[PDB]
Amino acid sequence: AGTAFIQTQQLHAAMADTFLEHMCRLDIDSPPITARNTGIICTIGPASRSVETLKEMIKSGMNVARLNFSHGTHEYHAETIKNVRTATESFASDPILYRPVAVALDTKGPEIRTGLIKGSGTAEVELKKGATLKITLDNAYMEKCDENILWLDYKNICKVVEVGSKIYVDDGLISLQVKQKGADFLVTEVENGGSLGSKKGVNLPGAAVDLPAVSEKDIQDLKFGVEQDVDMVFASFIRKASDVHEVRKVLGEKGKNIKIISKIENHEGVRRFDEILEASDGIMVARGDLGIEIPAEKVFLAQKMMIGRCNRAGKPVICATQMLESMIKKPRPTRAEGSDVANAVLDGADCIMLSGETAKGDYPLEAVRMQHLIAREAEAAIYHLQLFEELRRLAPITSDPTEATAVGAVEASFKCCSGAIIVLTKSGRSAHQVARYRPRAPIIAVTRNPQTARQAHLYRGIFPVLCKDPVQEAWAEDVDLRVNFAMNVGKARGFFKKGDVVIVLTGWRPGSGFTNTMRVVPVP
Amino acid sequence: IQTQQLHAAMADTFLEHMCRLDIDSPPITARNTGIICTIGPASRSVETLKEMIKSGMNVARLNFSHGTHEYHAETIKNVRTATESFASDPILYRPVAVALDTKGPEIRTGLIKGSGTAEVELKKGATLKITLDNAYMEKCDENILWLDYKNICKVVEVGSKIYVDDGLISLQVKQKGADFLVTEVENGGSLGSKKGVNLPGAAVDLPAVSEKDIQDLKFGVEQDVDMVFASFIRKASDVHEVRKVLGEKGKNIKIISKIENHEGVRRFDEILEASDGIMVARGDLGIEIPAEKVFLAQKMMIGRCNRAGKPVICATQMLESMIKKPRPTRAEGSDVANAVLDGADCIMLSGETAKGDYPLEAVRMQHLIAREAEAAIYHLQLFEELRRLAPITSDPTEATAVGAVEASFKCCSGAIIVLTKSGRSAHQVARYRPRAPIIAVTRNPQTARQAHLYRGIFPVLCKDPVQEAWAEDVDLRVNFAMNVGKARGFFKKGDVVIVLTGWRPGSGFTNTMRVVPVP
Amino acid sequence: FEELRRLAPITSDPTEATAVGAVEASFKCCSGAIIVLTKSGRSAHQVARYRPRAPIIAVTRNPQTARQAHLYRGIFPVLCKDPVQEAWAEDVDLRVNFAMNVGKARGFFKKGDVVIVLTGWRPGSGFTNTMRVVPVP
């Protein structure tokens, strides 16, 4: 089998009257009665790169493999991809057990990195609380950083910063307040002490950081992605609509189908969220990176807002960073980490992304299993009913065949207590339009296009499944084949059993543009 | 000064309401969730407390796990001195409650071999013998370990876990015995002297009130505390014995039951019924039940307390980084917020304020987070659901109380002013979770303090003498609250507020609602 | 009622907000009546506008308003000829207890049922702003 593969459901429990009443019925002692619908993106790196590790991670519920292009060469990551694809395809000899797995390319982005600390690349220095530290743009100091002077590469840092602004260094381990501006320098006072190292990430709280959207390194990384046929791109440090447009433009005609997830990493991104969301295919709320750049008592408000708007607009949203960080060192997570993951699933996220945990952790395989366990337990606390009733009200009244059918499918999934909604689809769009309305039941999305099978994991509650059977001549039999394929998948997964009811979305003519034909089918 | 800016028309759907959250605009609502600070070494002084009350402390907790009766008597005296410093202007007088947190029943280990402070390495896979023989009680080491709980052999089976030093070390039982256990170390660590032992999912049959606590609870009654946080509650009869010890003399002292273990969560319903309120101790649960199921417990317990209309308090692991640092982490702010949004009435700061380097900033961040989180609450559905789920009765007070909340939404009221002796009339309003603050006016100083337990009650102590003409005595107290509310910033000249009063001085019920424009 | 409440325009008028709450409560308490003290009749009309189930016993000293009230549905007007008591609170209690006796005689309610009562607070305050839930003596 796998560990995470057999998610048996026990549908037909009549859903509660009110959201309050639903919380009151949560029994921690009973097991979860629902498929884990929230996708799981694991970052691949040193500890999980091998073909044998990946096989077990896919079995334990990995869906997307992220590659971090901040570090490593093109040759290095080409083999990381080859290993993912070998591991994924190991299960292909039984199409029922074949879970597809996506490949994500996370850009380096624009960044502000410090210089090399005095006697060699690895040596640190103590910045203590209240000491003066000079920041310089003069390249003479770029391998001569110490307690007193610090280089960094961003040449317009003097222009976007004023007196009194903060500068967070090494992902907010150290924080500095500017006392005096200058021609090509700043004089700062250390507030939070720490061990400063070589080439560390600097952030500039609420500054219009005017770097290029796509650095010249990234223009090569994005072409490598297109060349390697990645499925999605996590574009870093997005500030505005035109940043996303230039990420699109670089991918071009050749990789137009590659999905662009914009990462909201800074204050400017959150302010311009609406224009970014419109231009982006999805969103990634990078919480740790926001925690530097905006106040701690306002980050949860940003997360909720962004997750909210993405749900309304029907685009994926991903909750990244600071998920299960203790599992780099330890075999289990803390109470507060499990609660943090849960509350992100309940806020409405589609996917959860494990950063260090799986890339360079001592426990990469258990990290996936805890993520899976938390996401499935959290699923029981979701009151799917109001998510839907609100999403139906807020949607604009149109006479589109597909969207009216898609709603009715979800509608019926509640009234029939359906085990699933089976959706036949080439592009994935028909399945996405169903998932937009947040059903309780899993959406088994059947397809022949292998990319759409991979790209589907971005959406919540879609279980993609790749049909490799040849197209039957009689159109009606080709449907019956693919439907009966999903029936067998769903029975094997445990979503439903002999004699339950499921909803099925299909076309009517092979040639009709729309997925317009809904039917209520009892399971053979 | 929590200025409100009422009259913003509330959103259509909860989804739409989340979508309207702008982090850049300031919060448009009074911080309704109470703040309980634990007083200790860093915050004990009269001068520290004055600034903490100013920055939004409501309840002062005293931890009776540590310290003497003489020590805590003076901690209380300092709270009362600081509180009363503001009494010379009754408009600015915020009352402040005193909470007595019991030690409880516990399982403590012995003293490690050569001295009280000296550790030993338990390594992963080594055998460790647990013993009830008192000969070893000051001779613990890598091999043998004493502990005081004499029936430990009876409640544990082969294969059960034993977490030691608040879950730093964990041991699996291999062999039971007459008066011993043989365990295998799973999580290694530095074992010390007198450490807390827990027994995951065991019917731990210790006394509900230890003999130490029977003296601590009489000291509480003697010092006129306002509430008692009873520790390690497992079942209804535990709460009943905490009640029985307080007795006739301290019958008015509120008993908040702390749910610290697996058995408490299983029997939550019977405990909630017998308790005045609840405290979800999250860190202590995180030891005894799995980490992927604690948030489910918190949500359930906070849920049921909201339904039943009793206070619930979210304690432990709130802002722990602020022991050492002047600000909290992103994840701590999010953890506090999500507990306010889950539906908690109060938030309790443990170390942060007791023995922290930054006790005063810890209160200010708690206040800031709780006020920002307030904007994310969709008060409307909380109410509509609570109204539906409530049982149909023709009680005068409860029907009036609902109508007051009802009207608080339709008039976009700045407040609900409630006159009350016992506090009950104000509690019945707060039960239905209005958006507006509830200014609860009273002459009884204890009810003013005990009100902070409930969410959205702003208690205020009227020290004026009782006017002969009953109607003027009402008008006085109402106009007192009007001035408080204007000073706080809850509302201004020309806004509307709801006012609950009696009709006869003698009528049992708070039955008279009126919609009043602010003079 | 639920439709008439939705379609009504949101205002912070004391009288209209009280009047709705009176009807609201008339359903939740299963009230036998809504007793309304009124000179012009308007306070009773504003209650009747929202179409309660319970009868509205409208108490008044103005004999014309007692007659003109029959136009409105569910108002049972009743003319109090007692003189105005000096203590305002007793003058209310008189008129309320007058309607209680009318309502018991009509059969609208009996000893121990609940009724809603709309009054003023100051003799001088423009609004009928004071609602109370009263058990029948």
Numbering used by the authors:
A (entry chain B): 8 to 531
B (entry chain A): 13 to 531
C (entry chain D): 395 to 531
Give sentences copied directly from the paper behind this entry.
Pyruvate kinases (PYKs) catalyse the last step of the glycolytic pathway by transferring a phospho group from phosphoenolpyruvate (PEP) to ADP, thereby generating pyruvate and ATP. M1PYK is the constitutively active form of the enzyme and despite the high (96%) overall sequence identity, M2PYK has a low basal activity but is activated by the allosteric effector fructose 1,6-bisphosphate (FBP). Each subunit of this homotetramer consists of four domains: A, B, C, and N-terminal. The active site is formed by a pocket between the rigid body core and the flexible B-domain.
Phenylalanine and alanine were the most powerful inhibitors (nearly 100% inhibition) among all tested amino acids. Although all three tested inhibitors show a similar inhibitory pattern on M2PYK, they have different IC50 values: alanine has the lowest IC50 of 124 µM compared with phenylalanine (410 µM) and tryptophan (445 µM). Co-crystal structures of M2PYK with alanine, phenylalanine, or tryptophan show the amino acids all binding with similar poses in the amino-acid binding pocket (located between the A-domain and C-domain of each subunit). The carboxyl groups of the amino acids form strong hydrogen bonds to the side chains of Asn70 and Arg106, and the amino groups hydrogen-bond to the side chain of His464 and the main-chain oxygen on Ile469. They adopt a binding pose that is very similar to that observed in the activating serine structure except that the hydrophobic side chains of the three inhibitory amino acids cause a widening of the binding pocket and make contact with the carbonyl oxygen atom from Arg43, effectively pushing away the N-terminal strand. Binding of the inhibitory phenylalanine, tryptophan, or alanine stabilises the T-state structure, each protomer subunit is rotated by 11° relative to the R-state structures. The X-ray structures of the inhibitory amino-acid complexes show the N-terminal strand pushed by ∼3–4 Å compared with the R-state serine structure. The repulsive push from alanine, phenylalanine, or tryptophan leads to an interesting hydrogen-bonding rearrangement in which four Asp24-Arg400 salt bridges stabilising the C–C interface in the R-state switch partners to stabilise protomers across the A–A interface in the rotated T-state. The C–C interface in the T-state conformation is held by hydrogen bonds between Asp487 and Trp515, with the indole side chain anchored in a pocket further securing the T-state conformer. Measured intracellular alanine concentrations from various cell types range from 0.4 mM to over 4 mM, which are sufficient to inhibit M2PYK activity and stimulate (cancer) cell proliferation.
